[PDB]
Coordinates of all heavy atoms in Angstrom, one line a residue:
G29 N -61.4 -7.8 68.4 CA -62.6 -8.0 69.1 C -63.7 -7.3 68.3 O -63.6 -7.2 67.1
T30 N -64.8 -7.0 69.0 CA -65.9 -6.4 68.4 C -66.4 -5.2 69.3 O -66.1 -5.2 70.5 CB -67.1 -7.4 68.2 OG1 -67.4 -8.0 69.5 CG2 -66.8 -8.5 67.2
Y31 N -67.0 -4.3 68.7 CA -67.6 -3.1 69.3 C -69.1 -2.9 68.9 O -69.5 -3.1 67.8 CB -66.7 -1.8 68.8 CG -66.9 -0.6 69.8 CD1 -65.9 -0.4 70.7 CD2 -68.0 0.2 69.8 CE1 -66.0 0.7 71.6 CE2 -68.2 1.2 70.7 CZ -67.2 1.5 71.6 OH -67.3 2.5 72.5
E32 N -69.8 -2.5 69.9 CA -71.3 -2.3 69.7 C -71.5 -0.9 70.3 O -71.4 -0.7 71.5 CB -72.1 -3.4 70.4 CG -73.6 -3.2 70.2 CD -74.4 -4.5 70.5 OE1 -74.1 -5.5 69.8 OE2 -75.1 -4.3 71.4
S33 N -71.9 0.1 69.4 CA -72.1 1.5 69.9 C -73.5 1.7 70.3 O -74.4 1.2 69.7 CB -71.8 2.5 68.8 OG -72.0 3.8 69.4
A34 N -73.7 2.3 71.4 CA -75.1 2.6 72.0 C -75.6 3.8 71.3 O -76.7 4.2 71.5 CB -75.0 2.8 73.5
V35 N -74.8 4.5 70.5 CA -75.3 5.8 69.9 C -74.7 5.9 68.4 O -73.9 5.2 68.0 CB -74.8 7.1 70.7 CG1 -75.3 7.1 72.1 CG2 -73.2 7.1 70.7
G36 N -75.3 6.8 67.7 CA -74.8 7.0 66.3 C -75.5 6.1 65.3 O -76.5 5.4 65.5
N37 N -74.9 6.2 64.1 CA -75.5 5.4 63.0 C -74.7 4.1 63.0 O -73.8 3.8 62.3 CB -75.2 6.2 61.7 CG -75.8 5.5 60.6 OD1 -76.6 4.6 60.7 ND2 -75.4 5.9 59.4
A38 N -75.2 3.3 63.9 CA -74.6 2.0 64.1 C -75.7 1.0 64.6 O -76.6 1.4 65.2 CB -73.5 2.1 65.1
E39 N -75.5 -0.2 64.3 CA -76.4 -1.3 64.7 C -75.6 -2.6 64.9 O -74.8 -2.9 64.0 CB -77.4 -1.5 63.6 CG -78.4 -2.6 64.1 CD -79.3 -3.0 62.8 OE1 -79.4 -2.3 61.9 OE2 -79.8 -4.1 63.0
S40 N -75.8 -3.3 65.9 CA -75.0 -4.6 66.1 C -73.5 -4.4 66.4 O -73.1 -3.4 66.9 CB -75.3 -5.5 64.8 OG -75.0 -6.8 65.2
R41 N -72.8 -5.4 66.1 CA -71.3 -5.4 66.3 C -70.5 -5.1 65.1 O -70.8 -5.5 64.0 CB -70.8 -6.8 66.8 CG -71.6 -7.2 68.2 CD -71.4 -8.7 68.5 NE -72.6 -9.3 69.2 CZ -73.2 -10.4 68.7 NH1 -73.0 -10.9 67.5 NH2 -74.0 -11.0 69.6
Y42 N -69.4 -4.4 65.3 CA -68.4 -4.0 64.3 C -67.1 -4.6 64.7 O -66.8 -4.8 65.9 CB -68.3 -2.5 64.2 CG -69.6 -1.9 63.8 CD1 -70.6 -1.7 64.7 CD2 -69.8 -1.6 62.4 CE1 -71.8 -1.2 64.2 CE2 -71.0 -1.1 62.0 CZ -72.0 -0.9 62.9 OH -73.2 -0.3 62.5
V43 N -66.3 -4.9 63.8 CA -64.9 -5.5 64.0 C -63.9 -4.4 64.4 O -64.0 -3.3 63.9 CB -64.4 -6.1 62.7 CG1 -62.9 -6.4 62.7 CG2 -65.1 -7.4 62.3
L44 N -63.1 -4.7 65.4 CA -62.1 -3.7 65.8 C -60.8 -4.4 65.9 O -60.7 -5.7 66.0 CB -62.4 -3.2 67.3 CG -62.2 -4.1 68.5 CD1 -60.7 -4.0 69.0 CD2 -63.0 -3.6 69.6
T45 N -59.7 -3.7 65.7 CA -58.4 -4.2 65.7 C -57.5 -3.1 66.3 O -57.9 -1.9 66.1 CB -58.0 -4.6 64.3 OG1 -56.7 -5.2 64.4 CG2 -57.7 -3.4 63.3
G46 N -56.5 -3.4 67.0 CA -55.6 -2.4 67.6 C -54.3 -3.0 68.1 O -54.0 -4.2 67.8
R47 N -53.6 -2.2 68.9 CA -52.3 -2.6 69.5 C -52.2 -2.1 70.9 O -52.8 -1.0 71.3 CB -51.1 -2.0 68.7 CG -51.1 -2.2 67.2 CD -50.7 -3.7 66.9 NE -49.4 -4.0 67.5 CZ -48.9 -5.2 67.5 NH1 -49.5 -6.3 67.2 NH2 -47.6 -5.3 67.9
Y48 N -51.4 -2.7 71.7 CA -51.2 -2.2 73.1 C -49.7 -2.5 73.4 O -49.1 -3.3 72.7 CB -52.1 -2.9 74.1 CG -51.8 -4.3 74.3 CD1 -51.2 -4.6 75.5 CD2 -52.1 -5.3 73.4 CE1 -50.9 -5.9 75.8 CE2 -51.8 -6.6 73.7 CZ -51.2 -6.9 74.9 OH -50.9 -8.2 75.3
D49 N -49.2 -1.8 74.4 CA -47.8 -2.0 74.8 C -47.8 -3.3 75.7 O -48.4 -3.3 76.8 CB -47.4 -0.8 75.8 CG -46.1 -0.9 76.4 OD1 -45.3 -1.8 76.2 OD2 -45.7 0.0 77.2
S50 N -47.2 -4.3 75.2 CA -47.3 -5.6 75.9 C -46.1 -5.7 77.0 O -46.0 -6.7 77.7 CB -47.2 -6.8 74.9 OG -46.2 -6.4 74.0
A51 N -45.3 -4.7 77.1 CA -44.2 -4.7 78.1 C -44.3 -3.3 78.7 O -43.4 -2.4 78.5 CB -42.9 -4.9 77.5
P52 N -45.3 -3.0 79.5 CA -45.5 -1.7 80.1 C -44.5 -1.4 81.3 O -43.8 -2.3 81.8 CB -47.0 -1.7 80.6 CG -47.2 -3.1 80.9 CD -46.5 -3.9 79.7
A53 N -44.4 -0.2 81.7 CA -43.5 0.2 82.8 C -44.0 -0.5 84.0 O -45.2 -0.6 84.3 CB -43.4 1.7 83.0
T54 N -43.1 -0.8 84.8 CA -43.3 -1.5 86.1 C -43.5 -0.6 87.3 O -43.3 -0.9 88.4 CB -42.1 -2.5 86.3 OG1 -40.9 -1.7 85.9 CG2 -42.1 -3.6 85.2
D55 N -43.9 0.6 87.0 CA -44.1 1.6 88.1 C -45.6 1.7 88.0 O -46.2 0.9 87.4 CB -43.4 3.0 87.7 CG -43.7 3.4 86.2 OD1 -44.8 3.1 85.7 OD2 -42.8 4.0 85.7
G56 N -46.2 2.7 88.6 CA -47.7 2.7 88.5 C -48.2 3.5 87.2 O -49.1 4.2 87.2
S57 N -47.5 3.2 86.1 CA -48.0 3.9 84.9 C -49.1 3.1 84.2 O -49.1 1.9 84.4 CB -46.9 4.1 83.9 OG -46.0 5.0 84.5
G58 N -49.9 3.7 83.4 CA -51.0 2.9 82.7 C -50.3 2.2 81.5 O -49.2 2.4 81.2
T59 N -51.1 1.3 80.8 CA -50.6 0.6 79.6 C -51.2 1.3 78.4 O -52.4 1.4 78.4 CB -51.1 -0.8 79.6 OG1 -50.7 -1.5 80.8 CG2 -50.7 -1.6 78.4
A60 N -50.4 1.9 77.6 CA -50.9 2.6 76.4 C -51.6 1.6 75.4 O -51.1 0.5 75.2 CB -49.8 3.4 75.7
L61 N -52.6 2.0 74.7 CA -53.3 1.2 73.7 C -54.1 2.0 72.8 O -54.4 3.2 73.1 CB -54.2 0.0 74.4 CG -55.5 0.5 74.9 CD1 -56.3 -0.7 75.5 CD2 -55.4 1.6 75.9
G62 N -54.5 1.4 71.7 CA -55.4 2.1 70.8 C -56.1 1.1 69.9 O -55.6 0.0 69.8
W63 N -57.2 1.5 69.3 CA -57.9 0.5 68.4 C -58.8 1.4 67.5 O -59.0 2.6 67.7 CB -58.8 -0.5 69.2 CG -60.0 0.0 69.9 CD1 -61.3 0.1 69.4 CD2 -60.1 0.4 71.2 NE1 -62.0 0.6 70.3 CE2 -61.4 0.8 71.5 CE3 -59.1 0.5 72.2 CZ2 -61.8 1.3 72.8 CZ3 -59.5 1.0 73.5 CH2 -60.8 1.4 73.8
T64 N -59.2 0.7 66.4 CA -60.0 1.3 65.3 C -61.2 0.4 65.0 O -61.1 -0.8 65.1 CB -59.2 1.4 64.0 OG1 -58.0 2.2 64.3 CG2 -59.9 2.2 62.9
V65 N -62.2 1.1 64.7 CA -63.5 0.5 64.3 C -64.0 1.3 63.0 O -64.1 2.5 63.0 CB -64.7 0.7 65.3 CG1 -66.0 0.1 64.6 CG2 -64.5 -0.2 66.6
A66 N -64.2 0.6 61.9 CA -64.7 1.2 60.6 C -66.2 0.8 60.8 O -66.5 -0.3 61.0 CB -64.2 0.5 59.4
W67 N -67.1 1.8 60.7 CA -68.5 1.6 60.9 C -69.3 1.0 59.7 O -70.3 1.6 59.2 CB -69.1 2.9 61.4 CG -68.5 3.4 62.7 CD1 -67.6 4.5 62.8 CD2 -68.6 3.0 64.0 NE1 -67.3 4.6 64.1 CE2 -67.9 3.7 64.9 CE3 -69.4 1.9 64.5 CZ2 -67.9 3.4 66.2 CZ3 -69.4 1.6 65.8 CH2 -68.6 2.4 66.7
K68 N -68.9 -0.1 59.4 CA -69.5 -0.8 58.3 C -69.6 -2.3 58.7 O -68.6 -2.8 59.2 CB -68.7 -0.8 57.0 CG -69.2 -1.8 56.0 CD -68.3 -1.8 54.8 CE -68.9 -2.8 53.8 NZ -68.8 -4.1 54.4
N69 N -70.8 -2.8 58.6 CA -71.0 -4.2 59.0 C -72.1 -4.7 58.0 O -72.4 -4.0 57.1 CB -71.4 -4.4 60.5 CG -72.6 -3.8 60.9 OD1 -73.4 -3.3 60.1 ND2 -72.9 -3.9 62.2

């Protein structure tokens, strides 16, 4: 996807990539995930 920061040394959209648990626990636990954005566009 893309990320647009409302603060910092950033302007417009940046590319993001990440991973998430696609087979989460079936109890009321959250789905773990993470992503990265390199602030260069």
Side-chain angles (χ1 to χ4, degrees):
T30 52
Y31 198 99
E32 180 163 296
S33 185
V35 297
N37 184 13
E39 182 193 339
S40 201
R41 303 167 212 130
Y42 294 82
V43 165
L44 73 86
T45 184
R47 308 286 303 172
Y48 68 106
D49 174 1
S50 46
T54 42
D55 46 32
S57 291
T59 300
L61 78 180
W63 71 86
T64 304
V65 175
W67 303 106
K68 171 184 177 297
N69 63 7

